[PDB]
Each structure stands twice: as structure tokens, then as C-alpha cells.
Ligand binder design. Structure first.
Ligand SMILES: Cc1cc2c(cc1C)N(C[C@H](O)[C@H](O)[C@H](O)COP(=O)(O)OP(=O)(O)OC[C@H]1O[C@@H](n3cnc4c(N)ncnc43)[C@H](O)[C@@H]1O)c1[nH]c(=O)[nH]c(=O)c1N2
Ligand SMILES: CCn1/c(=N/N=c2\sc3cc(S(=O)(=O)O)ccc3n2CC)sc2cc(S(=O)(=O)O)ccc21
Ligand SMILES: *[C@@H]1O[C@H](CO)[C@@H](O[C@@H]2O[C@H](CO)[C@@H](O)[C@H](O)[C@H]2NC(C)=O)[C@H](O)[C@H]1NC(C)=O
Ligand SMILES: *[C@@H]1O[C@H](CO)[C@@H](O)[C@H](O)[C@H]1NC(C)=O
Ligand SMILES: *[C@@H]1O[C@H](CO)[C@@H](O)[C@H](O)[C@H]1NC(C)=O
Ligand SMILES: *[C@@H]1O[C@H](CO)[C@@H](O)[C@H](O)[C@H]1NC(C)=O
Ligand SMILES: *[C@@H]1O[C@H](CO)[C@@H](O)[C@H](O)[C@H]1NC(C)=O
Ligand SMILES: *[C@@H]1O[C@H](CO)[C@@H](O)[C@H](O)[C@H]1NC(C)=O
Ligand SMILES: [Cl-]
Ligand SMILES: [Mg+2]
Ligand SMILES: [Mg+2]
Length: 584
């Protein structure tokens, strides 16, 4: 018997387990599908980045109707630490109105103001050296970055010279320097905060900062390489879980909690635990013979990610060195690795293929001459057209509320809808942060070893292509600006300066967009039950007691930014919520 059982030892689950076990009278068992990492260089060393070491095996999408019926491999972590163990270490908060919007969907206690203290509590910022801050244009607001919390973050101690050309080009096309992208707005260019521990220039993943740091505690239990296969109930009270070996041996074990079960199994894991447990849409559960404990049509609905596009380039005059020097110049690569091994300096402090700066933009910043035409098209179109006919009416109502919030964001000069990056080598990246499209993740069987059906539904809402085409065009402005023209860039096939119309551009984007950056969210959404929600503002699953969702399944919709910083802070927040109820 334990006080709490947590299903999934990723960012959210380890953060919560750490905080709960600060009380020696509280025992927690974290059951995690994947193993402990081995401190491999591909995990700890940014320049050695090997995220494939711990991908969840055997996940594939359905044919994507919005992307020429392409099927894609599905990327998500299977390891203690979850996504933090294998992600690109990009550490960014959302914008103020993300959290304010979640509140306004009917979630008391949710706002930028209520999240800020948890962002600060989550982390310790280590400032860069003064010379690098000056040379690099690295700025921050120390008043809103944490100084005492467990997640270490800082910056690489080096930048590739081409990053200077790109910064100045971005400024030339209306992306100015941002004082601090952690301050609730990020309109322009800034250094990428990185979840690195500057004492060793190694990854600060949740395994380290929310397990190893406190692993002397006897009340903090971990069971790697096991799957939570089912929640156990006494009436409507969640009292325990069943678990099985991840490797598929015909063993099943029950373990019980005295206070609560917490799901932390991620956007693609949490809904499957709920549905196998009889918490989910009665149509699906009836088809599979699963007895209904709580009829929640929102479970597995509302899937979101943040699509990506890689644009290939050739250069007549690129500057040396650059990220591609690591792969095409054995001498350079060896010298940089030796430099890192000796004094922890140089290119190996940057995640492999990343540069050091990035840019974020609102819809009006991307599309100053046409954003009102995009907003009009989106306003004109019934929210129901984005979902299959016969979608549960409560789920449609919640989608319409999300959509109305996002259209306000499209009007807001201080909320981002897209990200631009250049690694300094042969490609650029353009990310779509705020899709209106919604996907699904549903079990196909009662067998807990079976992958769910994963349908991103990328590009099914036609507004998304209008936003994404605008982001593409802004990226093209950067590469055509004076400070980048000196390097002699040109788009390579299948892009090219000869694609000038929205139709010509998007035809290629439809063939190249990746549905996912492994940012899967929002499949157990925090909205009122009558809006298709799965959890309350206190993250309690509707219709049962003693059961919460901690992982980013609970988010209503995607942020202006990537999820990691908010995955940590939301778990810090929930730990205090749980402590308040049980007087811990
Ligand atoms: C390769 C890659 C790259 C990036 C990113 C991810 C990935 C995989 N992300 C996304 C970010 O890392 C991600 O959104 C968060 O880790 C989500 O945290 P959660 O706690 O929701 O899930 P998370 O995925 O962290 O943890 C879920 C855990 O549950 C486990 N699990 C699932 N089913 C289970 C079951 N039935 N029983 C037990 N355990 C189960 C999984 O094994 C996993 O460890 C990212 N974000 C960002 O901000 N910056 C970035 O640079 C990147 N880059
Ligand atoms: C560094 C760039 N980058 C990513 N690369 N992903 C990579 S790199 C990579 C190389 C190999 S290889 O070595 O076999 O070729 C295989 C798979 C890889 N993957 C797939 C996971 S994921 C990401 C997210 C964010 S965000 O979260 O901030 O948006 C920002 C930047 C990101
Ligand atoms: C990562 O953050 C932690 C927490 O703020 C740092 O740990 C503190 O470090 C100081 C100086 O070494 C110690 O005196 C404190 O006792 C530590 N506190 C805790 C709670 O651990 C660590 O220093 C950080 N890494 C860097 C590079 O600053
Ligand atoms: C995708 O497949 C459907 C069949 O389900 C077909 O009707 C449609 O034409 C296909 N789309 C493309 C672009 O090939
Ligand atoms: C920093 O900003 C200044 C002023 O715009 C510019 O001259 C310089 O090239 C920039 N350097 C980098 C590395 O971004
Ligand atoms: C698992 O074990 C039980 C009890 O021995 C048995 O009834 C069942 O056939 C086994 N299943 C598999 C997949 O081997
Ligand atoms: C390879 O890198 C080395 C070490 O920095 C440098 O001296 C050399 O000029 C590079 N070679 C090419 C062809 O860029
Ligand atoms: C357009 O440019 C691309 C990119 O270099 C090239 O592949 C193609 O030859 C050009 N297209 C036509 C129709 O001439
Ligand atoms: Cl292990
Ligand atoms: Mg210093
Ligand atoms: Mg050494």
C-alpha cells in the first residue's frame, strides 16, 4: 500500500512525486513504462544529441487526410524522465493569454498571475558569462526567472557566427530583440533558454532534477519498465492500479493507494489508461465490451501537436564554422569534442543541429497585410466543420470555446502563432504553434499492449494552411534580408524562389509538414464536463473520486511556445493543490 500511485514517470509525474515525498509520512510509487537512462553521452551531452535512444516503439499514425494521406511514425518518450530525457532542451514559457484563456474556459485559479510563482519555484536560472551576453545579445529579466528551484537552465557558452547574420536579418524584417521571452510575451528574436546544468554543461532532465536529487528518500518509490494497464475502483473511488511488464510477459499485479491515483502518462498514454478503465466515450467502450465507470466523450478527443516544416537551402558563401561543420569536417568535430571534454567550451554545448537564437511571431507580425482576412475566414466557419459529423455535442461546444479564445489570440499582437529557426546549416525550421485542427487517440482493443489509433488530423481545418503559408513567407523574408544575402542562400527543391503563389507553396508544404514535434497534448482536457472536458480546474476526473491527470493531456490547447517549462510548472502547481486537500 502507498499514499499515492503515479502512472508515468515523465516530467509531470517525477515533479509531482518529488514534491509529495517532501512529507516523510507520504509514500509514492511511480510506475514508468521505460527504463532508467544510463547517462549515455547521447542523453547528457548537447552536441551528442541522440533522442532515438528512448522513443516509444510501434506507434504509427492513421493516414493523414490533410497531408495527402501520409502515415507518419509517432514520436514520444519511453524512459524515466519522459520527454525531458530525450527532447531538444528548449525551455520556454507560454504567453500570458495562454494561461488567462485556460482560466476563461471555466477554470478558476488559472491565469498568468497564478502560474508565475510556480514558473519561478520550478527552476534555477544560471546567467551566461558577461562577454557572451554582450557579444551574443543575450538578455533576461532576473526578477521573473527562478533562482532556487530544481530545474537548471542556462544557455550554451558558444554561438556559430552565422547566427549573427540571421539575428540581424530577422531584425531587418520586423522581428526585434525580445528582452525576456519568459516574461509572458516573445514577439521577435531571442536566445533559446536550454535545460542544461552549467556546472557540467549536461542535460538537466526530470530523472536528475526530480528523482536523483531526492533519491535518498525511502518514501519515493520507482518501478521502471512497467505499464499501468488499468485503474482499480471501489464504486466510483479510484483505489489502485494494475500493472504489467512493458516487455509483454503474461504477469499482472495490483497495487493500492490510500489517497489518490494520478495519471502522468502523457498525451498518448493517459487517455488509453482512462479508456481501458471504463472512463471514456460510451460508444467506444460499448463497442469494446468495457463497462462504463464514467461516460466522458472528451477522453481521447482534442489531440493537438505543433506541426513542423524543414526547408532545405544551398549557400554560395556560408560562413565557417556552422552546425554542418560537425558532420562534414571530421577535424572540426574532433577539435570541438576535445575542447568540450577539456574545458566544457564550444559547439558541443549546443543541442546538435540547433543554433542559439530563435524567433516567435503573432499572426499580425507574420501577415501584416492579410491577418484580418485569415481571422474573417476563421470567424465565418462554424467550429463544427473542424470535427467529424456526429462528434459529441459537448466536445463541439468545448472546441468552439477554444476556437473563440484562439481567434482572440490571432487578433492579439502579443501572442505567438509560429516559430522560425535556422541551425546555421542546410535547413530552416518553421513551427505552427496554434493549430485549429483537432485529432484523436483511441484504444483499438482491450489488450493493454496494443498501440492506440492515433489520428493527428493535421491540416483538416483549412485555416491552418493560411496561417502556415504566412509563416513560410516570413521565413523567406529573413533569408532574403541584406544580412543573410551575404551568405548567398537559396531555397532548394522541392521549395524554391520559383514558387511564388500560396497554392504553389502550400502544395509542397502539404507533402513535407510533419504533424508532430512530440508535443502531444490536450486529450484529457481541463474544461467543464458540459464542454467535453475530462477534468475539473483541480485536475479531478469527472464522475470519480481519488483520480487526477497531471500530464499535458489536461491542457485545453497548445501554448505560444513548447510544452516543457509549463509541464514542470503545472506539476509544481498541482503538487500544492493535492497537499492542500490532504493537509500534507
Ligand atoms: C524528441 C522530443 C523532442 C522534444 C519534445 C519531446 C520529444 C519526445 N518536447 C515535448 C516535451 O518534452 C513534452 O511535451 C513533455 O515531456 C510532456 O510531459 P508529460 O509529463 O506530459 O509527458 P512525458 O512524455 O514527459 O512523460 C510521460 C511518461 O509516461 C510513460 N507512460 C506512458 N504510458 C504509460 C503507462 N501506461 N504506464 C506507465 N508509464 C506510462 C512514458 O514512458 C513517459 O515517460 C519538447 N518540449 C519542449 O518544450 N522543448 C523541446 O526541446 C522539446 N523537444
Ligand atoms: C534540435 C532541433 N529540434 C529537434 N530535433 N529533433 C530531432 S534531431 C534528430 C536527429 C536524428 S539523427 O541523428 O538520426 O539524424 C534523429 C531524430 C531527430 N529528431 C527527432 C526528435 S526536436 C525539437 C523541438 C523543439 S521545441 O520543442 O522547442 O519546439 C525545438 C527544436 C527541436
Ligand atoms: C542547479 O540549481 C540548484 C538549485 O538552486 C543549485 O543548488 C544550489 O547550489 C548552491 C551552490 O552550489 C548550493 O550552495 C545550494 O545548497 C544548492 N541548493 C539546492 C536546493 O540544491 C545548483 O547550483 C544549480 N546549478 C548551477 C550551475 O547553478
Ligand atoms: C485520401 O484518401 C481518401 C480515401 O479515404 C481519398 O478519398 C482522397 O482522395 C485521398 N486524398 C489524396 C490527396 O490523395
Ligand atoms: C547583436 O546586436 C547588434 C545590434 O543590432 C548587432 O550589431 C550584432 O551583430 C548582434 N550580434 C549577434 C551575435 O546577434
Ligand atoms: C496468462 O496466464 C493465464 C493463467 O495461467 C492464462 O490463463 C492465459 O492463457 C495466459 N495468457 C497468455 C497470453 O499467455
Ligand atoms: C575543418 O575544420 C578545421 C578545424 O577547425 C579547419 O582548420 C579547416 O579549415 C576545416 N576544413 C574545411 C574544409 O572547412
Ligand atoms: C524551380 O526551382 C527548383 C529549385 O531549384 C528546381 O528544382 C526546378 O528545376 C525549377 N522549376 C521549373 C519548373 O523550372
Ligand atoms: Cl531500469
Ligand atoms: Mg557568471
Ligand atoms: Mg576532462
Amino acid at each position: 500500500n502507498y499514499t499515492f500511485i503515479i502512472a508515468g514517470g515523465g516530467i509531470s509525474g517525477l515533479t509531482l512525486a518529488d514534491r509529495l515525498t517532501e512529507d516523510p509520512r507520504v509514500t509514492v510509487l511511480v510506475i514508468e513504462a521505460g527504463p532508467l537512462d544510463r547517462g549515455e553521452d547521447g542523453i547528457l551531452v548537447p552536441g551528442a544529441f541522440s533522442p532515438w535512444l528512448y522513443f516509444w516503439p510501434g506507434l504509427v499514425s492513421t493516414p493523414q487526410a490533410g497531408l495527402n494521406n501520409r502515415t507518419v511514425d509517432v514520436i514520444t518518450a519511453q524512459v524515466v524522465g519522459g520527454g525531458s530525457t530525450i527532447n531538444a532542451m528548449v525551455y520556454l514559457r507560454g504567453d500570458k493569454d495562454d494561461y488567462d484563456s485556460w482560466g476563461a474556459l471555466g477554470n478558476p485559479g488559472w491565469s498568468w498571475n497564478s502560474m508565475l510563482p510556480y514558473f519561478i519555484k520550478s527552476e534555477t536560472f544560471t546567467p551566461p558569462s558577461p562577454e557572451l551576453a554582450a557579444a551574443g545579445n543575450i538578455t533576461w529579466d532576473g526578477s521573473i526567472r527562478g533562482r532556487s528551484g530544481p530545474v537548471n537552465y542556462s544557455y550554451p557558452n558558444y554561438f556559430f557566427p552565422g547566427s549573427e547574420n540571421w539575428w540581424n536579418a530577422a531584425n531587418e524584417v520586423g522581428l526585434p530583440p525580445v528582452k525576456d521571452p519568459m516574461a509572458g510575451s516573445k514577439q521577435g528574436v531571442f536566445w533559446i533558454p536550454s535545460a542544461i546544468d552549467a556546472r557540467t554543461m549536461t542535460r538537466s532532465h526530470a530523472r536528475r532534477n526530480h528523482y536523483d536529487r531526492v533519491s535518498s528518500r525511502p518514501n519515493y518509490h520507482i518501478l521502471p519498465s512497467h505499464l499501468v494497464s488499468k485503474i482499480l475502483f471501489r464504486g466510483k473511488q479510484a483505489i489502485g492500479v494494475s500493472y504489467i511488464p512493458t516487455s509483454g510477459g503474461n504477469t499482472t499485479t495490483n497495487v493500492y493507494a490510500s489517497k489518490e491515483i494520478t495519471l502522468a502518462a502523457g498525451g498518448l498514454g493517459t487517455p488509453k489508461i482512462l479508456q481501458l478503465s471504463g472512463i471514456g466515450p460510451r460508444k467506444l467502450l460499448n463497442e469494446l465490451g468495457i463497462p462504463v465507470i464514467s461516460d466522458l466523450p472528451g477522453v481521447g478527443q482534442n489531440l493537438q501537436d505543433q506541426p513542423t516544416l524543414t526547408i532545405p537551402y544551398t549557400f554560395t558563401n556560408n560562413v565557417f564554422p556552422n552546425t554542418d561543420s560537425l558532420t562534414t569536417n571530421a577535424t572540426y568535430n574532433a577539435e570541438q569534442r576535445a575542447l568540450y571534454d577539456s574545458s566544457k567550451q564550444g559547439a558541443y554545448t549546443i543541442v546538435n543541429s540547433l543554433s542559439t537564437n530563435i524567433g516567435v511571431m503573432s499572426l499580425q507580425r507574420a501577415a501584416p497585410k492579410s491577418y484580418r482576412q485569415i481571422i474573417a475566414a476563421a470567424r465565418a466557419r462554424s467550429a463544427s466543420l473542424s470535427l467529424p459529423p456526429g462528434t459529441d455535442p459537448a466536445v463541439i461546444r468545448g472546441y468552439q470555446a477554444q476556437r473563440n479564445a484562439i481567434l482572440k489570440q490571432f487578433e492579439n499582437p502579443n501572442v505567438g502563432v509560429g516559430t522560425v529557426h535556422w541551425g546555421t546549416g542546410s535547413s530552416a525550421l518553421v513551427y505552427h504553434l496554434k493549430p485549429l485542427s483537432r485529432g484523436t487517440v483511441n484504444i483499438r482493443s482491450t489488450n493493454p499492449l496494443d498501440a492506440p489509433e492515433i489520428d493527428y488530423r493535421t491540416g483538416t481545418d483549412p485555416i491552418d494552411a493560411q496561417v502556415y503559408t504566412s509563416l513560410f513567407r516570413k521565413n523567406r523574408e529573413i533569408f532574403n534580408a541584406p544580412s543573410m544575402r551575404v551568405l548567398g542562400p537559396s531555397e532548394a527543391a522541392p521549395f524554391g524562389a520559383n514558387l511564388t503563389t500560396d497554392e504553389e507553396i502550400y502544395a509542397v508544404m502539404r507533402e513535407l509538414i510533419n504533424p508532430s514535434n512530440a508535443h502531444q497534448c490536450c486529450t484529457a482536457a481541463m474544461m467543464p464536463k458540459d464542454m467535453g472536458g475530462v477534468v475539473s480546474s483541480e485536475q479531478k476526473v469527472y464522475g470519480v473520486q481519488g483520480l487526477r491527470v497531471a500530464d499535458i493531456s489536461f491542457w485545453p490547447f497548445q501554448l505560444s511556445g513548447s510544452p516543457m517549462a509549463t509541464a514542470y510548472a503545472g506539476a509544481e502547481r498541482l503538487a500544492d493543490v493535492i497537499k492542500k486537500e490532504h493537509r500534507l
